[PDB]
């Protein structure tokens, strides 16, 4: 029992040390997609012109 749980904890630590990075990357990507939508709007405007 004692040896099982510590290893399980370490595996979970690894998984969290992946999730946090995916989260930060996702937020940065959100900003990037906002900028991309801005570019889309610029193109939209350029259509009429």
């Amino acid at each position: 029992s004692h040896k099982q749980l510590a290893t399980e904890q370490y595996r979970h630590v690894e998984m969290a040390r992946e999730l946090a990075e995916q989260s930060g990357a996702s937020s940065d990507l959100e900003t990037d997609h906002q900028a991309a939508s801005d570019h889309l709007n610029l193109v939209q405007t350029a259509m009429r012109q």
């Binding site: 969290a16 995916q22 996702s26 990507l29 991309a36 259509m47």
Partner: protein, 49 residues
């Protein structure tokens, strides 16, 4: 035309649709990534407790 080039956007309808679709797809994929992070964080919590 000078205004066109100052904004510099190519302003071709085809490229407009393609770019907008790609950015929307990236929006959706990124939302999927955030959701995935959420579910895996849920799993981290469950396992830890």
């Amino acid at each position: 035309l000078q205004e066109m080039k100052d904004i510099g956007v190519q302003a071709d309808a085809n490229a407009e649709m393609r770019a907008r679709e790609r950015r929307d797809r990236l929006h959706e994929a990124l939302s999927v990534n955030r959701s995935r992070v959420n579910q895996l964080e849920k799993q981290i919590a469950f396992c830890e407790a």
